[PDB]
């Protein structure tokens, strides 16, 4: 059989367009201290972000609708995302090493997947 898990998670930036009307995007963000970045920590099953199938825990949010968030604070990042409108254009980049700093007992394996012991 041909298992996905062995395959490396792409590390280059991607464009994700989520259409969520007037409901939550369905994911959590962490970070936003001293320009450490804004990262996805949790995606809600069945939510708009999940239904896109193009975002994952450990993704850094680089921008929303053209607004650079690489250096944003967590609160202003949340404000930007919550007020982004019905159609939300995210530029994300998978940064599992930087993300693993946040979640207890986490680490990155050989394929780039975030593992928690």
């Amino acid at each position: 059989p041909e298992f996905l898990g062995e395959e490396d998670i792409p590390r280059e930036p991607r464009r994700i367009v989520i259409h969520r009307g007037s409901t939550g995007l369905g994911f959590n963000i962490v970070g936003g201290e001293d320009g450490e970045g804004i990262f996805i920590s949790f995606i809600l099953a069945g939510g708009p972000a999940d239904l896109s199938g193009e975002l994952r825990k450990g993704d850094q949010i680089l921008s929303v609708n053209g607004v650079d968030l690489r250096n944003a604070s967590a609160e202003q990042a949340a404000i930007a995302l919550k007020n982004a409108g019905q159609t939300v254009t995210i530029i994300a980049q998978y940064k599992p090493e930087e993300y693993s700093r946040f979640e207890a007992n986490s680490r990155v394996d050989s394929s780039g997947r975030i593992v928690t012991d």
Binding site: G24, L25, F27, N28, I29, V30, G32, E33, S41, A74, E75, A77, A78, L81, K82, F102
Partner: peptide
């Protein structure tokens, strides 16, 4: 430090 928000 830290903060986590649902969006």
């Amino acid at each position: 430090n830290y903060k986590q928000f649902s969006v």
